[PDB]
C-alpha cells in the first residue's frame, strides 16, 4: 500500500520522516503505535503520522 502526503510534517526524531504535500510514501505498514505508519520516502524508511496522509486506493 502507498500513501499520499496531504499535510506537511517535520520529523522531531531521527526515526521519523519529514514529508511534504504531494509526495508519495511507498510500502507503508501500520504500526502498533496508534496514529503512526512506517514507509519509504526518497529511498529511506521512517515513521510518519497517519492523519497527515491518505491511503492510495
Amino acid at each position: 500500500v502507498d500513501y499520499i502526503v496531504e499535510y506537511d510534517y517535520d520529523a522531531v526524531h531521527d526515526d521519523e520522516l519529514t514529508i511534504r504535500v504531494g509526495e508519495i510514501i511507498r510500502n507503508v505498514k501500520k504500526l502498533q503505535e496508534e496514529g503512526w505508519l512506517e514507509g519509504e520516502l526518497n529511498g529511506r524508511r521512517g515513521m510518519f503520522p497517519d492523519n497527515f496522509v491518505k491511503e492510495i486506493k
Binding site: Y7, Y9, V12, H13, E16, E33, E34, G35, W36, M47, P49, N51, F52
Partner: peptide, 8 residues
C-alpha cells in the same frame, strides 16, 4: 521518547 499524535 513517546510520540504524540501530531495535529495539522
Amino acid at each position: 521518547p513517546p510520540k504524540p499524535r501530531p495535529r495539522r
